[PDB]
């Protein structure tokens, strides 16, 4: 997990925020692993990834990537979706199956903390004052 990057463990707040050393970083490690793979290769588009070993210190993932500008990708209209410019850098927005597990979305009674759009798109709609015109 992550250690809170704060000098000498002094967080300077109320005692519920003395959390230096039990903090857990709510996005997954595989989503971290895809994120620094598609960051190095910003010309590449990232599809998803999987597990290929873990030691005690390191964890190894094979990340699969897609060149949007090669003609075996820019033809074949069942592959043309990724070369459409809304899919630029999918893991920095949290769109892949490794990364979309961390947003907590899905249908159900267990997942309607995000029942409009995303997590904070629910929060903005729950916490807006919807005063009408004739009220």
């Amino acid at each position: 997990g992550r250690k809170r990057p704060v000098p000498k463990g002094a967080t300077y707040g109320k005692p519920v925020h003395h959390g230096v050393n039990q903090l857990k970083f709510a996005r997954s490690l595989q989503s971290v692993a895809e994120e620094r793979a598609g960051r190095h290769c910003g010309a590449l588009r990232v599809l998803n990834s999987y597990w290929v070993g873990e030691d005690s210190t390191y964890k190894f993932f094979e990340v699969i990537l897609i060149d949007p500008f090669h003609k075996a990708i820019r033809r074949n209209p069942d592959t043309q979706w990724i070369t459409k410019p809304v899919h630029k850098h999918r893991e920095m927005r949290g769109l892949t199956s490794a990364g979309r597990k961390s947003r907590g979305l899905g249908k159900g009674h267990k997942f309607h903390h995000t029942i409009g759009g995303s997590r904070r798109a629910a929060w903005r709609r729950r916490n807006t004052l919807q005063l009408h015109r004739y009220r």
Partner: protein, 52 residues
């Protein structure tokens, strides 16, 4: 800008006021005392034929 600009009136009062607004436009005193010079005109609910 979220001042209550707009007002509701329930519709039987809208229709109450619109029957009271038409019935006073037939009395010659109320329509002339609002200023409309209606001296020389004939019969007060003026009806010209549908060719107009």
């Amino acid at each position: 800008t979220w001042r209550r600009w707009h007002r509701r009136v329930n519709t039987t009062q809208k229709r109450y006021a619109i029957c009271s607004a038409l019935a006073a436009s037939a009395l010659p005193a109320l329509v002339m005392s609002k200023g409309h010079r209606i001296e020389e005109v004939p019969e007060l609910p003026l009806v010209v034929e549908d060719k107009v």
